[PDB]
Write a protein that binds this ligand. Structure first.
Ligand SMILES: Nc1nc2c(ncn2[C@@H]2O[C@H](COP(=O)(O)OP(=O)(O)NP(=O)(O)O)[C@@H](O)[C@H]2O)c(=O)[nH]1
Ligand SMILES: Nc1nc2c(ncn2[C@@H]2O[C@H](COP(=O)(O)OP(=O)(O)NP(=O)(O)O)[C@@H](O)[C@H]2O)c(=O)[nH]1
Ligand SMILES: *CCC(=O)Nc1ccc(S(=O)(=O)N2CCCC2)c(OC)c1
Ligand SMILES: *CCC(=O)Nc1ccc(S(=O)(=O)N2CCCC2)c(OC)c1
Ligand SMILES: [Mg+2]
Ligand SMILES: [Mg+2]
Lengths: 212, 214
C-alpha cells in the first residue's frame, strides 16, 4: 500500500553503476564504444526489446525495471552507402541503456541521457496514452541530451498484439514525419523489426560522427 | 529502514538542476579555456554546501538547509601553472562547476550517478563528529569503485575548524589517514573561510597537472 525505496532496490542500482564505471574505465585504453538509451512509459517493452535483441528470448511476465540497467552486445557495423552500397566493417561494442519508465525514477533516469549518443523511444501500440506521451518524451530528450538535436528512432511496440492495437499506423507515421525521425513497428515477443530499428539508430550515430 | 521515495517537490528540484546542467554542458560543447568539474561528498551535515558557498560568494548561513539530492555552483577563476623553481606560467581561464551531493543514504544512488562527471573530489568530514571521520574510509573506497579514473585526485577536508571547543577528531588521526592514502589534507572552516580556497586550489592544481601529462 505504501512503498519506500528499499535497501535491496538501492543495492541493485549501485551494482549497475559499479558495472558502468568498470566498463568505462576499461574503454579508456572494442574498436568503438557506441552507447544509446531506451526510454518510454512503463510497460511499453523497453527491457523486453533489448533482451530480444541481445539474446533472442522473450519473457511474458512483467518484471518492472528497478531504476536503471544496461546490456551489451558486440556487433559489426558496415557503413551503408547510397543506393544499397555498404562499406568496411569495424567492430562496434554496444552499451544498451535501459531505463525505468515509472515517474518515481524520473530524476535518476534523466541523468543518464547525457551518456547516450542516441535514443530508442518506445510506445505501446496497444496503449494510446503511451503514444500521446511521445511528445513530452521528445522534448525531455532535446532538453537533457548531449547534443543540440539528438538522433532518435521511434518504436511502436507490441505489433504482435494485432487484435489490441489502438494506435492507427497513420497517426504514428505522421508524428514521426513531423519530427524527422525514423519509425518502426516492433515486437519483442517475436523479434520483428528489432534488429532493423536498432541498426538504424547505430547508422544515425555513426554517420553523424563522420561529419566532424 | 524506510527511505521515502522523492516527493513531487523534491523531484522538480532535481530536474531543474539537471536542466541547468544540460544548458551549461551544451554551451561548452559549442571563451574560457577549460571546463573543470569537482564533486563534494561526505556525510550529511559536515558542511559541503557551506564550503562551496563560502568559496563562490564569501558568505555563510547558520541555518541547516539540507541539500535535495544534488546541486552545483560555478566560479570563473584564473589558474597559473607552477613550473620548476616557481616558474609560474600564463594565466589560464578556468570555468569551475562544483557539484554538491546530498549525504543522506536515501540519495546515494542518485549522487553516485554523478561521479562520472567529476575530474576530482572534495571529501569532507566534520571535526566535531568522530563518526563522520570514521566513514572517510568507506567514502574513499566508494570513490575508487565509481570514479571514472583510476586513482582519482582527492583533497580531504576536515571542516568546522572554527568550533575549537567542540573539536573531537584528533589531528594526528586524520593526518595519518591522509598520508595512508597519499591525498592532501586541509582543516577548513566554512564560517570564517579558513583554508577553503587553498583546498579547492590544491585540487585544481592536481587536475591541471594531471591533465598536462596526457
Ligand atoms: N505481446 C507482447 N508483450 C510484450 C512485448 N514487449 C513487452 N511485452 C510485455 O509487456 C510487459 C512489459 O514489458 P517490459 O519490457 O517489462 O516493459 P518496460 O518498458 O521495460 N517497463 P518498465 O519501464 O517498468 O521497466 C511484460 O509483460 C512483457 O512481457 C511485445 O512486443 N509483445
Ligand atoms: N561553525 C561552522 N558551522 C558550519 C561549518 N560548515 C557548515 N556549518 C554548519 O553546519 C551545518 C552543515 O550545513 P551544510 O553545509 O548544509 O552541510 P552539508 O554537508 O552540505 N549537508 P547535506 O549533505 O545534508 O546537504 C549547517 O548548519 C551549517 O551552517 C563550518 O565550517 N563551521
Ligand atoms: C551529437 C550526438 C552525440 O551525442 N554524439 C556523441 C559522440 C561521442 C560521445 S563520447 O561518449 O564518446 N565522449 C564524452 C565526451 C566527448 C566524447 C558522446 O557521449 C555521449 C556523444
Ligand atoms: C584521470 C582524472 C580525470 O578524471 N580526468 C578527466 C579529464 C576530462 C574529463 S571530461 O569531462 O572532459 N570527459 C568526460 C567524458 C570524456 C571526456 C573527465 O571526465 C569527467 C575526466
Ligand atoms: Mg523494463
Ligand atoms: Mg548540503
Amino acid at each position: 500500500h505504501m512503498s519506500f525505496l528499499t535497501e535491496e532496490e538501492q543495492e541493485a542500482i549501485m551494482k549497475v553503476l559499479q558495472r558502468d564505471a568498470a566498463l568505462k574505465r576499461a574503454e579508456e585504453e572494442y574498436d568503438y564504444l557506441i552507447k544509446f538509451l531506451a526510454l518510454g512509459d512503463s510497460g511499453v517493452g523497453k527491457t523486453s526489446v533489448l533482451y530480444q535483441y541481445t539474446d533472442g528470448k522473450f519473457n511474458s511476465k512483467f518484471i518492472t525495471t528497478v531504476g536503471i540497467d544496461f546490456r551489451e552486445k558486440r556487433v559489426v557495423y558496415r557503413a551503408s552507402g547510397p543506393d544499397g552500397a555498404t562499406g568496411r566493417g569495424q567492430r562496434i561494442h554496444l552499451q544498451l541503456w535501459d531505463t525505468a519508465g515509472l515517474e518515481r525514477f524520473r530524476s535518476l533516469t534523466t541523468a543518464f541521457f547525457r551518456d547516450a549518443m542516441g535514443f530508442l523511444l518506445l510506445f505501446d501500440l496497444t496503449n494510446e496514452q503511451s503514444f500521446l506521451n511521445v511528445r513530452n518524451w521528445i522534448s525531455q530528450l532535446q532538453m537533457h541530451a548531449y547534443c543540440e538535436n539528438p538522433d532518435i528512432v521511434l518504436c511502436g511496440n507490441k505489433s504482435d498484439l494485432e487484435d489490441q492495437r489502438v494506435v492507427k499506423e497513420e497517426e504514428a507515421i505522421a508524428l514521426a514525419e513531423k519530427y524527422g525521425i525514423p519509425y518502426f513497428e516492433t515486437s519483442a515477443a517475436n523479434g520483428t523489426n528489432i534488429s532493423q530499428a536498432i541498426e538504424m539508430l547505430l547508422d544515425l550515430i555513426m554517420k553523424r560522427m563522420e561529419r566532424s
